[PDB]
Design a protein around this ligand. Structure first.
Ligand code: IHP
Ligand code: IHP
Ligand code: CL
Lengths: 14, 209, 201, 13, 207, 14, 209, 13, 212, 213, 13, 14
């Protein structure tokens, strides 16, 4: 998933 | 956004305090009423993926909605990666793995890769889902009632019809059978005297007294 | 909309946030009173068809009117194809923005000579809005009469406000339906409205 | 018809 | 309107949402009080005939006033056609003229100010409207027994502004009616000040 | 007459 | 007003809706309080005589003040005429008569000419200087209180008193060296004297908290 | 007498 | 901020009254709700360190949070310094990034240099980092406490859930919480439905499944 | 103000009506609360001495403060004059004259003279110098008008710790230093006080506030 | 002194 | 420390 539940839009992973 | 300067060149511009405020207020006031979606589309005119993410992130509340929105973006980006193999991958369009000048890169290129307009399309699809899920009334429940002016009833009908966003064949079938069928006795008889194929203004003029 | 830059060139610009808000607010405040129409026309100065559709689509409520509007746009577009069957001229749906892209619309409007699909589409919409104003006019002009204690000014205001929404015959009817005491003073003139209003002040 | 009943303005077919 | 850009050339601009509501709100807030005319003129800076028509058409209500205004426009244009047997009266009033015909005439050299000409007509009808709606005569302004001289002078020239004659009548008013209709406490001081006294001196004398 | 009663300012003739 | 554009030449620009409304609201809300004058001067930054007349003319009411103002403009304009007598050489502009600075007998183009000329003939700033002189006279005629009538109340905090003192002193337009201390509370008055002459107003005001 | 009593500012005589 | 002009060169510009006022009002109206963070970041688009301090200094009130913010800026500066020791330009110390020790000219210099040192974006990253701490602390509810009322509409609960989850924020607890906690803390009638759908049910499928 | 235009030349532009109103409202709304100072400084970004004088003169009321403000300007100008004896005499062609104290304050300088100094190469920031005097005086005013002393902020028996810390650092800001982390724990709730002492010294404010949550 | 009591900021003496 | 308690953001030292 590009977006994980509860993390902001455009939030880069890890 | 990316707007055009005086030399004819596309340059990046900061999202304005006006646009930030208008989108916040329109959401605070009209929640996911259908007309919120075209407001978003205009307020995000020229938006980069970052800007769209800003607009969505400026929403306080509606986190069930925002979570469904994330899941649509997921759906659409995973579908993008299935259909596309430096070209942007799905996470780049959604702004998680792209930088601002990378986004500006795709959008100000010739030929442009409109990652902003592509992301926007994803967002509109999820917002459209929220409008239908949050639609308060079903079309089969819109009935005129004894004292309601036909205009106010037609208003309630097409308002409900817009939010439920059903297929065009079903919308036609709704206007063709349910609209006249669920009118109060005073107007239903006047409309039958007009006969088939009457235009909406013909019906509305006919039932103003 | 399409505005012009530093040179003679016409460039596309995003719809303004004030514009977007003023149009939504004008519909909430003045509903379909007649003065909304020129307000729309001014707010849509330089608009492309997409811009017009955005403005229309941002309207929450008034969906009865908005359906009436689609029916009038349909009528005008089929009418366009009946009179218009270098550049590829646009089909009716191209003008209404359903089958034309923004770059296609920008193309027609920035051409020399331009094919003003925005101004043409606006013409259609204005035609539909004027139909709505006539429908929402609560009273017909054949029903506004001067009260006996009512000043002739307040009556004329009520008269031409009603005539405007209903969109010689007015000259006959206005003086004929004045209260009896002003009616003879206006009848004695036999004449500009200014002369009539001072005659009954 | 350019716009079917209940479809938004500018909606592509 | 036709404004000047940053390269020194007159180009057409859209009327702004701000000018439009500025005009709509002045009319809603003020029933053709005298100061509406200078607001209109300022709000219509650089306006084309089309723009002027836009500003007028946005006025909701006051349709008596608007109908009188049209008739003044008729007469002023009808008179233009006699003095002029090229822009005809109907072109300046924007009924038969296009925006591009209008933009052309206004950016011509020598300029043909069809905007300023039409405005000249509109301002003239509006002045007719303020006079018709003027509530009080200058002869009814008399200083109250407990009314401060300032507040009376305020009433006097405010009324004089709406009942606009020619400065002969306005000066005949000032040099007699203002001093004559003051309350007898302050009135005797005005003659003691002497007839040539300035307004400022008169007000200090009755403070 | 350039303008007819109840018709808008700048309304074209005919 | 006459502004500077981007290619550096002084060009005429329409008075904005915002400046117009700003001046009307300042007169409505604050009438002729002393601080409306610098607001006027700032709202008319770069104004042509025509602009100033618009600004004055949009004022509804205050016609006593407005007439007092017209009479001052006369005196200043006649004084200009008596001191600046007034064909024209090709390079030059005709000379501005007193009525021309006030905008009664000059066209907007003549004004723009005088102001955009090199060297500039600042008919707007001269006209403004006249109007502000008339406005200052109005402020002092309408000042309700004399400086000699401000005395510190027994329960009144010393700051509230100094506020009242310099507020009224401002409106009247030195005579305040010892006027402030002499008209202070009996308890604060001796404290100020214990500081001695030459105490700063900060020293005086902290001393009577 | 640039402005006469009761005449608006900037009014041409 | 430093923005691009209409002739293409990076120029310093005054912070606008609209932006200054926007920031004051959002802090006033919304204190430190999670969404104040994106509003700050966007309102400070292109900000110099001077500009960021001006925005922070304009906040009247919330001085406890502002003090926590000072302490986070402090930790980040002490951490910056412990990580960074011709005509080669002077790299910024932590206090330079924060604008205490550096001038506007110095700030512009780092930001418009080739290669740029985005002290504005760096200062912003610290401030955003401190603001996120503040949002976490002012969160009224813990995610574990959130339970669907016996008569509460499912959608209102999911709203409360992800609203609580967003302020809690790093990623570890949240992805598992969505997986386990949402279905687990639903009222007895919606939970047993949600379990019947299985893993891989979408939130959409879950919300129609409990719409009544 | 003096701003940089599309052609990159430092050019004068009028103070905008938005800025004028913004400054008037901030003073009306918030008087001399500490946050008014950075609000002024930002509202006068690029200001000329004239612009500063306009903004100050537009304030209706607060005449005690404005007069203290004048005395600060006086003090600051006299020290400028004593350190900058202008070399009176003919000035050299293509050079500006040297600015006296009253020139920086905008009383004896014309607008064009101010623009000359500010757009000089290198600029003479008379706008920035005046702003420094004015902000100096404004800070003296903020200290005097602060209503509560730091010694009077004690945590209420039912008052949340957060609201008490708010009141503390707010009143701390008005007066303008070592007594901070000491006094804060000392005036907390009898409940919260024993918790903060139990944490031990060296605690961050975040750490204390969670402890009394 | 540059500024005298009761005259405006920027006032020429 | 770059920032001291009760002193404003960006406040210069010494
Ligand atoms: O004074 P007005 O002419 O009636 O305009 C106001 C003004 O907006 P502008 O400064 O952009 O003209 C308000 O702002 P403030 O003076 O309070 O700073 C603004 O409120 P917001 O800043 O919250 O948007 C308000 O808008 P609204 O009616 O949505 O509250 C808007 O009125 P208009 O949009 O009708 O012009
Ligand atoms: O459309 P205008 O009447 O010419 O006013 C514009 C407009 O400001 P407003 O919307 O508050 O009237 C611009 O804002 P946007 O339309 O771009 O959102 C603003 O630009 P900024 O928001 O970047 O400040 C600009 O100001 P400026 O000329 O300093 O760039 C300002 O022009 P005016 O201050 O001359 O009215
Ligand atoms: Cl600057």
């Amino acid at each position: 998933p590009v977006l994980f539940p509860g993390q902001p839009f455009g939030q880069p992973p890890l | 956004p990316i707007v055009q300067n005086l030399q004819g060149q596309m340059v990046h511009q900061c999202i304005s305090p006006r646009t930030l405020n208008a989108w916040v207020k329109v959401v605070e006031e009209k929640a996911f009423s259908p007309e919120v979606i075209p407001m978003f589309s205009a307020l995000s005119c020229g938006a980069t993926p970052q800007d769209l993410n800003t607009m969505l992130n400026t929403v306080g509340g509606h986190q069930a909605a925002m979570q469904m929105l994330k899941e649509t973006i997921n759906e659409e980006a995973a579908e993008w990666d299935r259909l596309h193999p430096r070209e942007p991958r799905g996470s780049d369009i959604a702004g998680t793995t792209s930088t601002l000048q990378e986004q500006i890169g795709w959008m100000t290129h010739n030929p442009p890769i409109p990652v902003g307009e592509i992301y926007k399309r994803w967002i509109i699809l999820g917002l459209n889902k929220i409008v239908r899920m949050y639609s308060p009334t079903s079309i089969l429940d819109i009935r005129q009632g004894p004292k309601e002016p036909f205009r106010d009833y037609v208003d309630r009908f097409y308002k409900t019809l817009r939010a439920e966003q059903a297929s065009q064949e079903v919308k036609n079938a709704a206007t063709e059978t349910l609209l006249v069928q669920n009118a109060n006795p005073d107007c239903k008889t006047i409309l039958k005297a007009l006969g088939p194929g009457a235009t909406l203004e013909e019906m509305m003029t006919a039932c103003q007294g």
